[PDB]
């Protein structure tokens, strides 16, 4: 319901990468002033892929098996480390390979033969570019329309869904679709379909979003404005300040995530930042965007 409890918060974290939970940064407008940003978590340069994942992502997976939705988004300027955090490499796997291994192992266990629940994992992969929704699994299929059902579920009819059981099944569809990317939102959707095999025969579904956003060079508060980054900011603020109006419908991203941001959903936004001087303006801007609180000290 709209009333009877405020909406769930959007958790916010900062990941400061090495040179290649409050943060303090110099104010180059006034050198007597220091900018102090507050987050739900802070991961410094010594924080590894497993630290990010065990600290902020692993704990929300169990909520997908309760029929709850979850969103993980990497925000920040190009070069900051969004793709490193979200995808990573075979040496240092990111959030996506870690959550996929865990979720598939969890569903292979909880949905095994003889278990009271039948579990089926599917995947979808899309891109948000210039407010157009594009299926990365079925390219050259056009701008997709986002709909809503009578129960409040967000759905994209005809967006391709691939059934997956093992990691190889995930790799089969994901790796080729992964291969501009700095200027578009990469949305991986992992859907857990749950069927009770004994009375009362309940049916659940948990949707997990893993998002590698467009570079925040395109999101300096009032460079071009990315409608979906701008509206995400408004939506995150509305949810984390308890404002009566949340403008989900003002962008494709927030409309797609309407049932996976706020409500009873679990969500984590990671503000990826870099330590180099050449990033300073985009660092300040990413911190203003994502911080749950800000002070001038
Ligand atoms: N936490 C990190 N530790 C080490 N290297 C990192 C880290 N994050 C990013 N990098 C490196 O920084 C560069 C840019 O990172 P990338 O993930 O492509 O950023 P983005 O996707 O935000 O533009 C790459 O060479 C990548 O390996
Ligand atoms: Cl360490
Ligand atoms: Cl690492
Ligand atoms: Cl939910
Ligand atoms: Mg990237
Ligand atoms: Na409510």
UniProtKB/Swiss-Prot annotation:
It is found in: Nucleus; Cytoplasm, Cytoskeleton. It comes from the Eukaryota. Expressed in bone, cartilage, joint capsule, ligament, skin, and primary cultured chondrocytes. Residues 9-296 form the Kinesin motor domain. ATP binds at residues 76-83. Ubiquitinated; mediated by SIAH1 and leading to its subsequent proteasomal degradation. Kinesin family member that is involved in spindle formation and the movements of chromosomes during mitosis and meiosis. Binds to microtubules and to DNA. Plays a role in congression of laterally attached chromosomes in NDC80-depleted cells. Interacts with FAM83D. Interacts with SIAH1. Belongs to the TRAFAC class myosin-kinesin ATPase superfamily. Kinesin family. It is linked to Spondyloepimetaphyseal dysplasia with joint laxity, 2: A bone disease characterized by short stature, distinctive midface retrusion, progressive knee malalignment (genu valgum and/or varum), generalized ligamentous laxity, and mild spinal deformity. Intellectual development is not impaired. This is Kinesin-like protein KIF22. The lineage of its organism: Eukaryota, Metazoa, Chordata, Craniata, Vertebrata.
